[PDB]
Amino acid sequence: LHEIPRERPATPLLDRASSPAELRRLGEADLETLADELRQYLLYTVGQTGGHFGAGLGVVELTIALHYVFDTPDDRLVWDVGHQAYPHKILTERRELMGTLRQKNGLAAFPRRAESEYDTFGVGHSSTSISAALGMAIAARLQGKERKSVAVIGDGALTAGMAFEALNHASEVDADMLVILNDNDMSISHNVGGLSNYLTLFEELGWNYIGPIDGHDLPTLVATLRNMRDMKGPQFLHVVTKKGKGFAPAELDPIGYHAITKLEGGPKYSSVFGQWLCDMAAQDARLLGITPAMKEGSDLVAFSERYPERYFDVAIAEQHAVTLAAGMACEGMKPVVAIYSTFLQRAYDQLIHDVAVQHLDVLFAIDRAGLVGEDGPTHAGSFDISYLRCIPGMLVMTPSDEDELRKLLTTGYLFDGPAAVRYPRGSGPNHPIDPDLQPVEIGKGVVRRRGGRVALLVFGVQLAEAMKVAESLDATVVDMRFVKPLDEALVRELAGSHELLVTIEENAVMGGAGSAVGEFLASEGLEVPLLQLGLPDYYVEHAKPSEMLAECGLDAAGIEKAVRQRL
Amino acid sequence: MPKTLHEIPRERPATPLLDRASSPAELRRLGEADLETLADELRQYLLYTVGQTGGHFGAGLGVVELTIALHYVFDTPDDRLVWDVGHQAYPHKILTERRELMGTLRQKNGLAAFPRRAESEYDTFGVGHSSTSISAALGMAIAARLQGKERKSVAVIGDGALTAGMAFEALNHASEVDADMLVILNDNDMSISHNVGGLSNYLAKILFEELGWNYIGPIDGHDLPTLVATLRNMRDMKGPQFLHVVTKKGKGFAPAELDPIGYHAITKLEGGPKYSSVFGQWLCDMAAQDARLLGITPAMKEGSDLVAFSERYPERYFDVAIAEQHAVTLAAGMACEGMKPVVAIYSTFLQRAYDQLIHDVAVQHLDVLFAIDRAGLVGEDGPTHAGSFDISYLRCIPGMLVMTPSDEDELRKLLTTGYLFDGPAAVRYPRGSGPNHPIDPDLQPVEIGKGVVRRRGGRVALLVFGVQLAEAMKVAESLDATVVDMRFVKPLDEALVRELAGSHELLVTIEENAVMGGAGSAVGEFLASEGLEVPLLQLGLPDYYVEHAKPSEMLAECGLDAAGIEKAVRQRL
Amino acid sequence: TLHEIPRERPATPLLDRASSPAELRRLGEADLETLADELRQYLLYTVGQTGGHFGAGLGVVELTIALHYVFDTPDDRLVWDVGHQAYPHKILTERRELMGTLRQKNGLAAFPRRAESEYDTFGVGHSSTSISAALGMAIAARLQGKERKSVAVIGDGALTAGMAFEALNHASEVDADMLVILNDNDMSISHNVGGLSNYLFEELGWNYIGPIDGHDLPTLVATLRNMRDMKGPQFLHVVTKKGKGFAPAELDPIGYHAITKLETGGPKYSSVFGQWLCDMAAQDARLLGITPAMKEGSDLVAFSERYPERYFDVAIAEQHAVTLAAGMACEGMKPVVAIYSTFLQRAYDQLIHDVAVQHLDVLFAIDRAGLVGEDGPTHAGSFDISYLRCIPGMLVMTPSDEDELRKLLTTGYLFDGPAAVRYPRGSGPNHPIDPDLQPVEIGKGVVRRRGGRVALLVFGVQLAEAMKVAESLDATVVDMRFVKPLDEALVRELAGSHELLVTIEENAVMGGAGSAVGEFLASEGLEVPLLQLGLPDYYVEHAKPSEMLAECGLDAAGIEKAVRQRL
Ligand SMILES: CC(=O)c1sc(CCOP(=O)(O)OP(=O)(O)O)c(C)[n+]1Cc1cnc(C)nc1N
Ligand SMILES: CC(=O)c1sc(CCOP(=O)(O)OP(=O)(O)O)c(C)[n+]1Cc1cnc(C)nc1N
Ligand SMILES: CC(=O)c1sc(CCOP(=O)(O)OP(=O)(O)O)c(C)[n+]1Cc1cnc(C)nc1N
Ligand SMILES: [Ca+2]
Ligand SMILES: [Ca+2]
Ligand SMILES: [Ca+2]
Ligand SMILES: [Ca+2]
Ligand SMILES: [Ca+2]
Ligand SMILES: [Ca+2]
Ligand SMILES: [Ca+2]
Ligand SMILES: [Ca+2]
Ligand SMILES: [Mg+2]
Ligand SMILES: [Mg+2]
Ligand SMILES: [Mg+2]
Ligand code: NA
Ligand code: NA
Q1: What are the recorded GO MF terms, alphabetically (chain B)?
Q2: B147 to A3: CB separation less than 8 angstroms, yes or no
Q3: Closest residue by Cα to residue C354 from C320, C390, C310
Q4: What's the Cα-to-Cα distance from B24 to each of B28, B95, B121, rounded to whole Å?
Q5: At what angle do helices C130-144 and C162-174 cross, to 10 degrees?
Q6: Before C112, cis peptide (omega within 30)?
Q7: In the 8-state DSSP scheme, what is residue A98?
Q8: CB atoms within 10 A of CB C166
């Protein structure tokens, strides 16, 4: 195909395959026509809603073959990451719901147990499929059940250490499971790493290796899968697909068609970071840039092109990224680790043990801080203030706009020790950006408005919304800048001169920046009323970022109501 | 009422609105009611700037409105616009960030004669030879569709360029692939001469609809409201679209409207015969002596100068339109019946009839003469028109007699020689005039395969193949070299080369053709086959495309003036 | 669900058994969800045959079924607000097989209409009258002791109108037994704006129930049954999706508000106005554009995109639109109120008292002047010349084509005071439009044709037809341009040089432009015969615009006949 259909395509066979049981009643000679019809519907519906695109096209045939051969949902199918699982959802009683995909109260971005019995494991983060499938296989055997266990994992997801740990353990217990490597020689960017060069190691680890086979030859897929379904012990099938298969524009540009917006401001914070990284690297030859397979997302694109000898994509290996930075810092170089808040969860131990405990000079640029929108709770950056500020030695910063991000990145970089700067997805208020590269004083907030009875202590990008509230209430507003060290002097002054302190952050209230203020007030015996605004103690369902923020009360309307209700 | 301008402005005309349309993006910010004023100003500037630099003239005036409408309606440069030939693309250049550079047009290091990809992002395809626009735009449209770029592809082709076979091939293929593209036939019932052919006859009556094309028109190519409205409607249509537009060559300038042939090109405002004129006189003279002579040109009566011949012998003159391939095979058929066809064709255009020359003429050893004008460097038209290869690509073809006259008298003599020769013959000569030597008025051949020693000397021998002879005689004076007017590349004067190789210390070959595969290499091949061990210095055109400039400037760059030849021989010795 | 509009009458055996509410009420609750599907099939089909309003009716298919199933119609009073959503209502009230005549001459009307059926309690078209009318019926029923129910279905858009606020407050005061059902789909024609939409009763004395799913028939029937017998003012909040059941309409609720029947001219006058508004705004920062919820119809689309800070949608609030403009003009701004002639009569007092009495600089761009076609007499712009020309200070203008509209908008805009420019729906003769922005002399007509004997004084778009008649009669023809101030010098000249003066206008003859000419002739004692052509003193039944103009004698044939008979 060359264009995305704008009207629903005619899919008479797909319409008869609304669930796997229905699909399995069709004949083999029908599956290649079904594949065509599924590809057309997929193009149509993702064109309608936006969403992940290329990876799903690559597994259209694999998905058909899997549900045709295996007795799903009794047999357990685990998709790694799940961004390639739209065909899976189309064939599991959700085709006519795809119009709600990634919309409030609609289908989720990834497989989700609560959404369908056909989703065995909620995914989003990568490389969990083998571990989860092995647990189900072990349990099923102990229960005396005869079900199969299958994990589909891409070549990029396979670069993570936890996939290696799983492959190793499965051999040890001699589990009856099938791992299918979906190898398209791609991640988001090109798959760079020693494992992609290799793509036997799988044989030597205790797995029976079959392949590589054509992942788009349905006859070979069904016959091969049929053979291995009833084979015993750890089985490993190497499949080769093409990302974007069947849509030429995506085959020709797999990066740009990894995801698309539905068919028909200022710079993104990631772009501000990318410019800062290039500018600082131009002035300091010691700066090194690290990403775990997210060059495009964190926006190290220009940096990678201009400073290729100082740019490092470690594949989907968050752990190694951080300890690698620690080693670089030991030799006097200046590593910057670009990592999403949600993915830094996977390198927590390396940050604590290898960086913080040693007080090594490593800067963490934490993107996608806060609510991330349609990708949903698996990717929310809800916790990084809480899980970092309890770590001794960490400098924790929360910029309120573009200029502040540039300044605090510079501040964290020039600081000799571990520093973190957190910022959200998307763009900001579009304030002027100072082109200079100058730091700000550590541990000092900035008073943005002087008012009367309420003091709003803002940690991060809710400042503009708090300013609206403060103009309505004639309140004091502080751009806190730093969670740790806290501007204790300023907090103390405001606690004496105001009747109510209000803290605002795009992080879990539990353990968050507002609780840092609470800890200070308590330790000094200051008993001013304190209202903590932030993310609630549940997982916020996917929606537009504005709808999720409104749900959490972090727009002007929600902030003002909370304040006035307290007063 | 439209006004007819009658004089070329000598001073920069006042064009305040054109100055606000320096690029298509700026033009598209203007209002549709301003475009007809813009068209008048663009015409005034066009007349002024070509009067300053010389260049192509009438064709550009005919597409002023069409060019304005195209950049107004289409999203250039993202939408792809392909101009056929490109001689009519001065308005295009003026609207695409090059207005104030038009003063450098066709000068060394200035704007080139035609659209050029390296010159501007608004130039999608380098043109010069005709009839490539449809094929090129089709390829662009096919690639854009596979890439998902939703680009528009537009080819503007004149009624003359549409007479070429390759345009017919592209129209038929575009229908097969159901390409989303627009072909605009710029019909003005003119080529350089009057457009004479069966296609021209059919276009006057009005299928492209029988082919897989949606035909719209004809429409007035000088009615900007209609052009804009029509292009707007067709821009968003799918599949192969064909818009028939009617224009007037020279529109707006009364002298060019009256005399479209004479105003196809002009020299900027304020010697012996041209070689083309020497050929034209020979053609008439031989035709008066031989009823068998037939004269053929692919739409270049004026350039090759068959003018007097076409008037004196209309029944024996054949303009085949821009159809180089058919011209050659037609000559072959004529020769089969005992007639004596002469194919007048520029060196750069004969490469489009190469297969007809080999397969239909040379394989059959048929009696056809090729009068190859514009051999060598052609000057301002630049590399797309360079006659750089005809010695190389003809000399490897068995049966070919290949000749290189050195002056006016030699051209007449070698035309007679190749004409009378019972088989295929080629005589190459350059644009412009020569040394103005006396021309023997008789019509007699010379001995085939024999050069003429024009200076007896020693030590160094200059083996000259063509018009650099006069420069080589200058160099020979200081060196006391011998100089041979070789006359024939094929058959080579082997007996003389063998003598000189034995009596001299250095052989120097000179030719206005690529050194690679050229006439010097024929000398080289002969020396090798006989085991002759004499140093050989091969002078000629280099292995790159020579940028446009005055002929003298291009020859100097390549080292084919007296100074360059002397330096080369001196540095070898 | 459905993706294409049926081209052949779909089989609807159960719908065909519910031809009236009494027949509907004999079916069982379990049959209603199938009935709803059959109704949508028929609705999509019939509107595809005739055209008309589309999305809103699809949104109330379930609500309409539930109301007639639970309530004892027609004895119980059901009032539909606006009525564009009442096609299902008509289909269920003995007009299903007459829907083929919908919006055609002598066929069913565009909206509910008392004369059309005993099931139509109140003729609607203009919005927000349902609560007032239902309250009136309830007060009367109570005094008569009838114990009948009174129900008003009102959309969230219609609820933004002041008169609905007035009805809600009075109903509370009198403690009326009535049910107000809010049909909340978060849509007007465009997206619903205003602080009410942002909020979406108890304090106003109403018992509020909901929100409930307006497409869940079990919940609807059960809820309505419960509230039917509750006493006092009852308020039910229902949530529906505009275009429910037809994917293209659900995706594009604005474009599917109304459709043309399934199967080259100049710009619509509304488009000429929209282009003028943009052109003038680019030359004058003072211009502000106001619309009461009719961005699409009046065509402020491009203006609202290019000048969003100077565009104001006040919801369905004609009154406030005008007084707001008066306020902006007090500060030196140049407001333009875009408003249909038929809707301007709801802001008559604000035009008189707040604008004209103060002689404030406000331009009224009066669209839909004259006959409007299939929407019928509730929407006719029949009276604006009559009700505006009697108001001192008003500049009243009647452009005859596209170029004249642009010129007279500029004239009224630059005029320092109140100005009105009226023009019809649809397109015009397609004459060239001068791109410049210059006014014309106030109070002067232009002679378009010099003739003799009879002079045609044309105010507005009948000029083209008058020119046709003038061809056969060799008549003088004047494009008057201005009703007020009148070109008295020109009328004086014509009265002394012709035997008959003929006035032509697309406005009521009574009080119209022709009567301004007669008033001048009388005051000067000029006794030239006067023939006044225009709209008759009755409400013209819906039909094609060309058929309604022919009925009124305002086409060339009708004008010619009337002139010849007078002569
Ligand atoms: C969007 C998202 O979450 C994806 S998809 C993807 C690479 C996918 O490569 P794979 O070869 O496994 O699949 P393919 O697309 O079919 O080639 C990454 C790194 N991410 C972000 C990411 C980063 N880091 C971790 C631990 N998990 C995830 N999901
Ligand atoms: C100078 C040059 O290269 C031109 S312009 C022209 C005819 C132009 O006719 P057209 O109708 O297509 O355009 P118009 O001028 O607007 O009428 C010819 C034959 N030539 C010489 C020529 C000969 N043969 C070929 C293959 N290409 C070219 N360019
Ligand atoms: C009939 C007409 O011209 C319609 S329909 C409509 C939208 C009403 O939205 P609502 O939420 O009440 O209904 P919905 O379609 O179900 O969402 C408007 C503003 N209008 C124009 C209009 C303007 N102003 C007034 C006083 N009355 C009307 N009818
Ligand atoms: Ca540092
Ligand atoms: Ca945010
Ligand atoms: Ca204050
Ligand atoms: Ca000339
Ligand atoms: Ca011969
Ligand atoms: Ca002689
Ligand atoms: Ca010379
Ligand atoms: Ca004007
Ligand atoms: Mg991959
Ligand atoms: Mg031509
Ligand atoms: Mg609504
Ligand atoms: Na993309
Ligand atoms: Na519509």
Answers
A1: 1-deoxy-D-xylulose-5-phosphate synthase activity; magnesium ion binding; thiamine pyrophosphate binding
A2: no
A3: C320
A4: 6, 6, 12
A5: 20
A6: no
A7: G
A8: 13
Helix (H) and strand (E) counts for chain C? 23, 19
Q: How far is CA B234 from CA B184, B188, B207, B223, B244, in A?
A: 11, 21, 19, 16, 12
- As a whole number of angstroms, the distance between CA A135 and CA A147 comes to 13
Residue A502 near residue A467 (C-beta atoms within 8 A): no
Indicate the residue type of B33.
A
The residues, any chain, with a CB within 8 Å of residue B188's CB and separated by 6 or more, are B62, B158, B159, B246, B247, B248, B249
Amino acid at B454: R
Helix (H) or strand (E) holding A507: strand A500-508
**How far does Cα B66 stand from its chain's mean position?**
25
Q: Residue length, chain B? A: 573
CA of A262, nearest ligand number: 15
| b/e map A374-408, b = 16+ CB within 10 Å | bbbbbbbbbbbbbbbbebeebbbbbbbbbbbbbbb
| C-alpha to C-alpha distances, A68 to A21, A87, A149, A327, C323, nearest whole angstrom | 8, 13, 15, 50, 68
Resolution in angstrom units? 2.0
CA distance A194 to A206: 21
Question: Can you tell me the distance from the alpha carbon of B294 to that of B371, in angstroms, rounded to the nearest whole number?
Answer: 12
8 Å CB contact of B146 and A248? yes
**By what method was this entry solved?**
X-ray
Going by alpha carbons, the residue nearest to atom 23 of ligand 1 is A316
With the most atoms of ligand 2 within 8 angstroms of its CB, the residue from B125, B264, B322, B373 to mutate is B322
E-strand ranges in B85-238 read 153-158, 181-187, 214-220
Distance in Å, alpha carbon of B144 to nearest chain A alpha carbon: 9
In angstroms, what CA-CA distances link C263 with A10, A206, C11, C64?
22, 67, 22, 29
Query: Alpha-carbon distance A44 to A5, whole Å?
Result: 5
The torsion region of residue A78 among left (phi > 0), alpha (psi -120 to 50) and beta comes to beta
Instruction: Give the separation between CA B361 and CA B359, rounded to whole angstroms.
Output: 6
Host H or E run for residue C239: strand C233-239
Indicate the SS3 state at residue C368.
coil
- Whether A76 is catalytic: no
Residue A424 CA, ligand 5 centroid: distance in Å: 6
Task: At C171, list the tokens.
Answer: 């109903």
Catalytic residue status for A318: yes
Q: Please name the helix (run of DSSP H) or strand (run of DSSP E) that holds residue B240, with its range, or none.
A: strand B240-246
Q: Which two tokens stand for residue C437?
A: 């922005």
Alpha-carbon distance of C511 to C503, in angstroms, equals 13
How many angstroms separate the Cα of B86 from the Cα of each of B101, B128, B159, B194, C62? 17, 6, 14, 19, 66
**What CA–CA distance (Å, rounded) separates A283 from B169?**
58
Instruction: Flag whether residue A489 sits within 8 Å of chain B, measured between CB atoms.
Output: no
State in Å, rounded, how far the first CA of chain C is from the last one.
Answer: 64
Which amino acid, one-letter code, is at B507?
Answer: L
C240 CA: nearest ligand 3 atom:
16
Query: Strand C476-479 to strand C363-367: parallel, antiparallel, or no bridges (unpaired)?
Result: unpaired
For residue A149, list its beta bridge partners. A76
Helices (H) and strands (E) in chain A, counts: 25, 19
Contact B163, B157 (CB under 8 A): no
Contact C92, C40 (CB under 8 A): no
Cα A345 to Cα A322, A339, A352, A374: the distances in Å are: 12, 10, 11, 20
Contacts with C3 from chain A: Cβ below 8 Å: 7-8
Whole-angstrom distance, CA of residue C426 vs CA of residue C545 = 9
Pairing of strands B488-490, B401-403: antiparallel
